[PDB]
Design a protein around this ligand. Structure first.
Ligand code: MG
Ligand code: ZN
Ligand code: ZN
Lengths: 97, 96, 1338, 277
């Protein structure tokens, strides 16, 4: 345990994660700060542009950048629209990516 | 891995959803099970764990219900093989 | 639910039944909207809908509309999954010929119409004309018409003439094939011919006619007028990222055919002439041909792409087909992998599993346990509890894995033990904790190796993992009877140091009242771990049947041996732990413990040895240092002396005394002698160096050295590795194959030079690059062995046969290398063994020989036993349970349903990665008995041998043969028969240089025609060194005297003619070249006269070439009939080996080449099993000339010699199991009852001989002869076409099975795997048995 | 020997001699009344010219045999549709229909997704104008600088260039090693996971079962609005027309029954943060 408490064989690994914004024929992809079906605990780490701050501790499953894509002809299931009215969430035509 | 996405033509596990696929069960591991007496362990890993639309979905419902016996059905690797031989002008059916 | 998957030709009326619509347009989808267009390759009207329960228009999109079909733009409402089953069809305007039935090894269309393959290709391309129904014209149906010859036919005949060209002509030639009439014509024209060049052509054409009659396939269906369309989901057109689409290679092929079919349909209504319409019909030929298969005479389309194309046939062939890709691998669920890690606290039946992997593997079992316990109401809420890792989820996961075993397997699965089941326990970490004892079967080291996990779901698979695949069940090897789970190097090191008697130690001579006082004295530090003490022990004896009697005695042992007896079970005595406990002694104790106390007390005893070995190997801090590799002080006196003995030779090389080759063998054999002298002087100083003091003395005991203990106990290291650490390294090899003159006189402790280290790199990379072939060649051998012996499975309980092969111990050499103890252990006897007395038998009947019967046969003088073997079994379609035995992982015999053919191929292919005469003298003392050796006693008191089929044996006083020596022809025998031999003295002498001769009778013999000027030549040596009649060569003879040969005429002294008994012609033998006549002309000895003196690859590819039954590069020449052989003409170019049978009247003449030096002479009688010319013999002629008993003895003993040299051991049942499948086909010698001249299976030939005998026919003249096939040709003989399409060519086995209507059953292993059914072997035998008695019965 | 489907057709059309420039007048007048004697000789004499025209479209989408056979479809249409009252020439009229038939066939049998003849004609203009601009002087092809040379808007050029399908093949080995295919790595969006399929069936059955644990009148108005119990989607005024028989009373029970299922869902372990987040 001395070689672990003294930080002998500890190494630093740098990982790169890229997010590209293409131009879908339905609509272009833009980096924003509005995400559907999320809460405040997921948008506090982002900024007014939609990218996390430098130096923020990110856990497994956190959002790095904001990106939504416009969708058309979703054909929502009538059993699904009854559940959205329970809480009161508005219908948004943007896919979370 | 327990479940995940499957391929288009052959309904086999694969990656692409921030997760790896499954363990490939080659012929060397089949001979090891054939050397044993495990006939139900070999059929389970070939039909209900891969290439079965009605087998994987109905086996998952059984594990939650409590009981689990078998769901053989027919592998998708053999259903596609029949439709490809028939397209070559060669008739092949099941006499039963 | 289905059986007998049949395959045949597709009729145009049946192709339209599979289809749900006809495609007319070549497009796929619309450019604006991504919807399937109508009457195209992608059409929701013909095939299924795109979306789930919704049409294209949208008038019906609910569940209540299933059979209602919209009329405006909708389709039949379905589950959107029928797009994999719906098919189409394209009604072609012109017929197209199938290339699968046209371009193959046999001409399916050519042989059916008696036409050439090239000539058919000429008519199908609209180049030549053929005649239909010639009749009363001047030409034959086989005669074709040209462009200038056809115009003349309509002028002279006019009537009764019809000629066509193209695919409609081939379709017309098959309309009037007259199937019920053509066979009647072939039956009356086959027996008229006699040449074999026409028998194989008319019979191969005849067998194809009966195939098209009983199967129901009409010859008209070989050419197709309508082709099916593959479902659209099998050729998907899916989009990609960025709006880009991706299609398959079959959409453009299907579009190219529709583009040319619609163009041909429009070109027929415009009244276009024949010049333009014949080229369009030609394009439609290669358009459909390129769609079916690629690589034929029709080049595939290649546009903006490198690879040519991927057609329909390319999806099931080409090492990448869908049928072959699944046979080599398939991804599964409920799996995972991680690195392995040793766990010394785990039991044998359990392993370590991380908590992060157990949450993912057992996820469905947690969702069902949370709802049943009441923690979650729905499955959507239970899934969120696992993502948060709530504390109550760990209590649920601990309950779902309590009795649920998991499967662990390593990537290289060489044998059965590669997959074992364990009970997982939750451990903290990310590495799989593996048991240290199961590391030998897995062949897994802790260098970063990974191990895959699998979870059995059904309780049928959970019971198979506990009762069959458990780690505690397979404690013995499936190839031998020895335990595979044995203490490794780290455990055997602690058990060796504990039981290691010392001369003087602390607490020596004290007495202990029980074993508990020994531990109490050792833990207090008042007694050494190994000191000579005396302890009273209470042990129990299991030697008595059912009586576990206890005995209390006082023994004289050490302290460590008494502590080791605390873990020994009650059934074993104390004498099993009084030794030093080496690795070979512990494995023999676990094997003896398994046969006495059983399995439950053994799995808990092997765990105690691991705990005791790990505990006492840590107390003794054994370590390797720089002073452990002791160097003998006399090594410098041997190296400096050997270096001076080479300096005196190099001076002789500069003087011209020795040559280059003579000096090479002098310095190579010199350093090899000095290397063995250092090795024997190093082990003497390394083993007996520890000195002690007992009441005042200097006594030498065994060395307590770390380097010596690790090699003596057998933990790690051998004599070849300690030799390179302390002693000299020796002479190194070379990739060319030679040995370097200068050896490596330094070891690894002192260090090597720069040149000495560069030399060692030659053999280093040679062994590393050899491992790449050891995994590629051995893997190809174990795969070929499975493809042959996969269908073999135990099906019958008792065959009821008495045939069997004789088993005798290997007495070759001085001592028996493999006695009858392990050669008969586990085999059922075939015939009752008899004592030397009368009416007294040892075994009552066919019984299973266990360890209790081996010693009962060793006390008696029984040496031969007739056992049962699979190669002699009579069970059809399987192997008997009593003919196999009990050599497996279990103690009892084999059960019904055990696939003994797969465990036999894995037992041979697993150790494949480890594979690459002047005089005789009796060694021991005993009587001398000779068998099958007819000798003639001379007048001096010596014996002369004339036959070579026999040998000399040394009979023990008990009556057992323990030494066997082979004697050449004319070997003089010193001792007589029936006398006590002397151990160390000669018994007979031979002459390997010059082959001696023998004389039948004495008399004044003289050379006839020996003028010494042409035939022979009088040679004289220096100082009268040679005074005899020396023969001359045939090339040195004259041109006129070359026809005459020197011959010796034997005449009696009285003058009467002397003739040998049993032969009409006298003993007139011609003297060959390079011969010397010791006896003068007119005077010879009474017997034993030498008139003429006749002067004179291993490893893995050896076993692979031996199973293939290949002929060697220089096959040996053997005799056919027992008779007097003779020579023929030599100046012609060959050698007529004539032979006259003395017992029967049947002369047989054969020819022999001249470059093969013969070893037989003229006038000597040879037997049937005698060898004439030296050289390796193929296993083919040994089966015909001797039989099947001699073939099974030669093959098994030749394969074992390759495995016994490397140290591994395989039972003989696994070699005889593969040999049974090779000796399966039979061949008939005469014709008249069979169809062709070739042979068929012996299972079908035997079932037909019983019906013809006890039927209308009296005799059975249709005999047969056994033939031998390799592991490549015997695998092709498979009645199934599903399994045959895996290892053979797919496109070749599908065209043959289609034209014959081969209904394939699923009564094998390889067929039920790709289909998805249960296998007949193992637990699946109860499923196939309960269905056979309910299908063919009530 | 060596045999091909190309030279076998060219050798058959090379044996017919050329038609005299003064003999086609007798065959053209006979073709109007209808006779299979002059039409066979007129088309066979023009088979040597369709090869030189088809050889100009080299390295195109169609093969050589498909271009020769497509040009022959216009020859029959050119002979049957003609007028010999001019008398100027006859070979210059057949090459107009043969050349027009190649263009209509090279744009309909080349791509997988078929493009109509009205949008495919203007597409070749953007591809022809982009070729000359890229080779002006060390120029790189791009869609920004081409919008000014053709006076096209920025949003119009991005749609014309993007209209080209250019479909790829899934049976191609990705990378240098030919051991993996593109089709074996693709996934589907319509089918789902076996766990997700059971998850949707469980929640659908729990929603319908929870409706029974309420009033007998509150379950009928909710089943008619969203259409869960085998009904279709409707509005509030349609349900309160005949079945409801109220204007604002139906809207009052709808907001109370909406919150009645909210409390029974949170107590069932399915809160808003677990489903709606
Ligand atoms: Mg390793
Ligand atoms: Zn519709
Ligand atoms: Zn038997």
């Amino acid at each position: 345990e001395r070689v672990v408490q003294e930080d002998r064989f500890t190494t630093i690994h740098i990982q790169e994660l890229t997010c590209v914004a293409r131009d879908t024929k339905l609509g272009p992809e833009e980096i924003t700060a509005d995400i559907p079906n999320v809460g405040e605990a997921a948008l506090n780490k982002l900024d007014e542009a939609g990218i996390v701050y430098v130096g923020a501790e990110v856990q497994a499953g956190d959002i790095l950048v904001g990106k939504v894509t416009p969708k058309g002809e979703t054909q929502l299931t009538p059993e699904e629209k009854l559940l959205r009215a329970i809480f009161g969430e508005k219908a948004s035509d943007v896919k979370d990516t | 891995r327990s479940t995940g996405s499957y391929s288009l033509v052959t309904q086999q596990p694969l990656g692409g959803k921030a997760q790896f696929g499954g363990q490939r069960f080659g012929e060397m591991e089949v001979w090891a099970l054939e050397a044993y007496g495990a006939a139900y362990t070999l059929q389970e890993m070939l039909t209900v764990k891969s290439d079965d639309v009605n087998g994987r979905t109905k086996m998952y419902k059984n594990i939650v219900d409590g009981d689990h016996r078998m769901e053989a059905g027919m592998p998708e690797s053999f259903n596609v093989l029949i439709k490809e031989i028939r397209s070559l002008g060669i008739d092949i059916e099941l006499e039963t | 639910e289905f059986d007998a998957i049949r395959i045949g030709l597709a009729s145009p009326e049946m192709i339209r039944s599979w289809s749900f619509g006809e495609v007319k347009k070549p497009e796929t989808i619309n450019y604006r909207t991504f919807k399937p267009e109508r009457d195209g390759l992608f059409c929701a009207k013909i095939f299924g809908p795109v979306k789930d329960y919704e049409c294209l228009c949208g008038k019906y999109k609910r569940l209540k509309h299933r059979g209602v079909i919209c009329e405006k733009c909708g389709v039949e409402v379905a589950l959107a999954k029928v797009r994999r089953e719906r098919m189409g069809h394209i009604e072609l305007a012109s017929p197209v010929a199938h290339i699968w039935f046209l371009k193959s090894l046999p001409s399916r269309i050519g042989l059916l119409l008696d036409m050439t393959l090239r000539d058919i290709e000429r008519v199908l391309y609209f180049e030549s004309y053929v005649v239909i129904d010639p009749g009363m014209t001047t030409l034959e149906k086989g005669q074709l018409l040209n462009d200038e010859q056809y115009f003349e036919a309509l002028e002279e005949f006019g009537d009764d003439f019809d000629a066509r060209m193209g695919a409609e002509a081939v379709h017309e030639l098959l309309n009037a094939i007259d199937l019920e009439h053509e066979i009647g014509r072939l039956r009356e024209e086959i027996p008229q011919t006699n040449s074999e060049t026409k028998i194989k052509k008319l019979s191969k054409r005849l067998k194809l006619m009966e195939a098209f009659q009983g199967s129901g396939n009409k010859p008209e269906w070989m050419v197709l007028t309508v082709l099916p369309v593959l479902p659209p989901d099998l050729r998907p057109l899916v989009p990609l990222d960025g709006g880009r689409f991706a299609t398959s290679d079959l959409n453009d092929l299907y579009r190219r055919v529709i583009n040319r079919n619609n163009r041909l349909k429009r070109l027929l209504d415009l009244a276009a002439p024949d010049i333009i319409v014949r080229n369009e019909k030609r394009m439609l030929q290669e358009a459909v041909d390129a769609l079916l298969d690629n690589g034929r005479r029709g080049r595939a389309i290649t546009g903006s792409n490198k690879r040519p194309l991927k057609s329909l046939a390319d999806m099931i062939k080409g090492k990448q087909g869908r049928f072959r890709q699944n046979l080599l691998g398939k991804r599964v669920d409920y799996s995972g992998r991680s690195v392995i890690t040793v766990g010394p606290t785990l039991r044998l039946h359990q392993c370590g599993l991380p908590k992060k992997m157990a949450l993912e593997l057992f996820k469905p079992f947690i969702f069902g346990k949370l709802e049943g316990r009441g923690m979650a109401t729905t499955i959507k809420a239970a899934k969120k509890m696992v993502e948060r890792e709530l504390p109550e989820v760990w209590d649920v996961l601990a309950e779902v894995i309590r009795e649920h075993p998991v499967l662990l397997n390593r990537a290289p699965t060489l044998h059965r033990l590669g997959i074992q089941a364990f009970e997982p326990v939750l451990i903290e970490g990310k590495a799989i904790q593996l048991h240290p004892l199961v590391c030998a079967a897995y062949n897994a080291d802790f260098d970063g190796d990974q191990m895959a996990v699998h979870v059995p779901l059904t309780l049928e698979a959970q019971l198979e993992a506990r009762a069959l695949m458990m780690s505690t069940n397979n404690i013995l090897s499936p190839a031998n009877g020895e335990p595979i789970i044995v203490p490794s190097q780290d455990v055997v090191m602690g058990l060796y140091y504990m039981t290691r008697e010392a001369i003087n130690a602390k607490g020596e001579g004290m007495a202990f009242a029980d074993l508990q006082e020994v531990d109490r004295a050792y833990r207090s530090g008042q007694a050494s771990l190994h000191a000579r003490v005396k302890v009273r022990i209470n042990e129990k004896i299991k030697g008595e049947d059912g009586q576990l009697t206890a005995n209390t005695r006082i023994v004289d042992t050490t302290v460590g041996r008494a502590l080791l007896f605390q873990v020994v079970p009650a059934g074993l005595p104390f004498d099993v732990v009084n030794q030093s406990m080496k690795k070979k002694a512990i494995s023999k104790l676990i094997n003896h413990c398994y046969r006495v106390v059983g399995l439950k007390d053994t799995v808990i005893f092997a765990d105690q040895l691991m705990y005791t070995g790990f505990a006492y190997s840590t107390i003794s801090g054994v370590s390797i240092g720089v002073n452990d590799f002791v160097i003998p002080d006399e090594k410098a006196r041997i190296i400096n002396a050997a270096t001076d003995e080479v300096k005196e030779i190099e001076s002789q090389y500069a003087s011209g005394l020795v040559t280059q080759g003579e000096k090479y063998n002098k310095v190579i054999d010199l350093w090899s002698k000095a290397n063995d002298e250092v090795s024997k002087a190093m082990m003497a100083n390394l083993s007996k160096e520890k000195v002690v003091d007992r009441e005042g003395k200097e006594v030498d005991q065994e060395s307590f050295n770390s380097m010596y203990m690790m090699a003596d106990s057998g933990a790690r290291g051998s004599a070849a590795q300690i030799r390179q650490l302390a002693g000299m390294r020796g002479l190194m090899a070379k990739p060319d194959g030679s040995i370097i003159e200068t050896p490596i006189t330094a070891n690894f402790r002192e260090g090597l030079n720069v040149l000495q280290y560069f030399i060692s790199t030659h053999g280093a990379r040679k062994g590393l690059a050899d491992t790449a072939l050891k995994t590629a060649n051995s893997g190809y051998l174990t795969r070929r062995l499975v493809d042959v012996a996969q269908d073999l499975v135990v099906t019958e309980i008792d065959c009821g046969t008495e045939h069997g092969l004789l088993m005798s111990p290997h007495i070759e050499g001085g001592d028996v290398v493999e006695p009858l103890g392990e050669r008969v252990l586990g085999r059922v006897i075939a015939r009752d063994v008899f004592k030397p007395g009368s009416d007294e038998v040892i075994v009552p009947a066919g019984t299973l020989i266990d360890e209790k019967w081996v010693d009962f046969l060793e006390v008696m003088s029984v040496d031969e036993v007739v056992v049962r073997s699979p190669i002699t079994c009579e069970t059809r379609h399987g192997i008997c349970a009593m003919c196999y035995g009990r050599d497996l992982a279990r103690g009892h015999r084999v059960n019904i349903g055990e696939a003994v053919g797969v465990i036999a191929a894995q037992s041979i292919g697993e150790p494949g990665t480890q594979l690459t005469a002047d005089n005789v003298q009796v060694k021991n003392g005993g009587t001398i008995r000779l068998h099958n050796l007819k000798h003639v006693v001379r007048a001096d008191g010596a014996l002369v041998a004339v036959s070579r089929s026999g040998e000399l044996a040394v009979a023990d006083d008990f009556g057992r043969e323990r030494e066997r020596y082979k004697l050449p022809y004319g070997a003089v025998i010193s001792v007589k028969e029936g006398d006590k031999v002397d151990p160390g003295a000669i018994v007979a002498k031979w002459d390997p240089h010059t082959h001696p001769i023998v004389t039948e009778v004495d008399g004044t013999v003289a050379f006839v025609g020996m003028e010494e000027g042409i035939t022979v030549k009088r040679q004289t040596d220096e100082l009268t060194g040679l005074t005899n009649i020396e023969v001359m060569d045939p090339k040195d003879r004259p041109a006129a005297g070359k026809d005459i040969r020197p011959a010796v005429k034997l005449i009696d002294a009285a003058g009467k003619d002397l003739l040998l008994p049993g032969t009409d012609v006298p003993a007139q033998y011609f003297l060959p070249a390079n011969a010397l006549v010791n006896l003068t002309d007119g005077a010879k000895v009474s017997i034993g006269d030498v008139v003429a003196r006749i002067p004179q690859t291993g490893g893995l590819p050896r076993v692979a070439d031996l199973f293939e039954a290949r002929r060697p590069k220089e096959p040996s020449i053997l005799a056919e009939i027992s008779g007097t052989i003779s020579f023929g003409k030599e100046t012609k170019g060959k050698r007529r080996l004539v032979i006259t049978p003395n017992d029967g009247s049947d002369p047989y003449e054969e020819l022999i080449p001249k470059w093969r030096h013969l070893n037989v002479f003229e006038g000597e009688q040879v037997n049937r099993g005698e060898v004439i010319s030296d050289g390796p013999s193929n296993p083919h002629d040994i089966l015909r000339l001797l039989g099947v008993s001699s073939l099974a003895k030669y093959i098994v003993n030749e394969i074992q010699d390759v495995y016994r040299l490397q140290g591994v051991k395989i039972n003989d049942k696994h070699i005889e199991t593969i040999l049974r499948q090779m000796l399966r086909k039979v061949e008939v010698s005469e014709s008249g009852d069979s169809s062709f001249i070739k042979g068929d299976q012996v299972e079908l030939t035997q079932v037909l001989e019983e019906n013809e005998q006890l039927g209308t026919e009296d005799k059975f003249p249709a005999k047969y002869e056994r033939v031998l096939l390799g592991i490549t040709k015997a695998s092709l003989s498979t009645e199934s076409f599903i399994s045959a399409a895996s290892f053979q060519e797919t496109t070749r086995v599908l065209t043959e099975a289609a034209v014959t209507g081969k209904r394939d059953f699923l009564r094998g292993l390889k067929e039920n795997v790709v289909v998805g059914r249960l296998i007949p072997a193992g637990t699946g035998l109860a499923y196939h048995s309960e269905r056979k008695r309910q299908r063919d019965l009530g | 020997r060596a045999l091909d489907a190309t030279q076998l057709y060219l050798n058959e059309i090379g044996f017919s001699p050329l038609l005299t420039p003064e003999e086609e007048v007798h065959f053209a007048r006979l073709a109007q009344k209808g006779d299979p004697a002059g039409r066979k000789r007129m088309i066979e004499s023009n088979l040597r010219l369709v090869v030189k025209i088809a050889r100009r479209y080299v390295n195109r989408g169609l093969s050589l045999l498909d271009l020769i056979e497509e040009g022959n479809l216009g020859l029959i249409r050119a002979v049957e549709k003609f007028d010999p009252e001019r008398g100027f020439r006859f070979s210059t009229y057949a090459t107009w229909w043969i050349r027009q038939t190649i263009e209509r066939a090279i744009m309909n049998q080349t791509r997988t997704i078929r493009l109509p003849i009205h949008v495919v004609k203007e597409l070749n203009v953007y591809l022809r104008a982009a070729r000359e601009l890229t080779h002006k002087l060390d120029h790189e092809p791009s869609p920004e600088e081409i919008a000014n040379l053709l006076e096209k808007p920025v949003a119009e050029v991005k749609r014309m260039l993007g209209l080209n399908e250019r479909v790829t093949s899934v049976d191609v080995s990705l990378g240098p090693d030919s051991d993996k295919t593109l089709l074996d790595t693709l996934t589907d969006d319509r089918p789902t996971d076996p766990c997700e399929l059971l998850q949707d069936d469980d929640l659908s059955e729990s929603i319908d079962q929870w409706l029974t644990e309420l009033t007998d009148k509150q379950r009928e108005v909710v089943i008619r609005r969203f259409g869960l119990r085998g009904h279709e989607s409707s509005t509030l005024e349609e349900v309160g027309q005949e079945i409801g028989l109220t204007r604002e009373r139906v809207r009052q029970i709808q907001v109370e029954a909406l919150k009645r299922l909210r409390e029974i869902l949170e107590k069932n372990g399915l809160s808003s943060d677990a489903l709606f987040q």
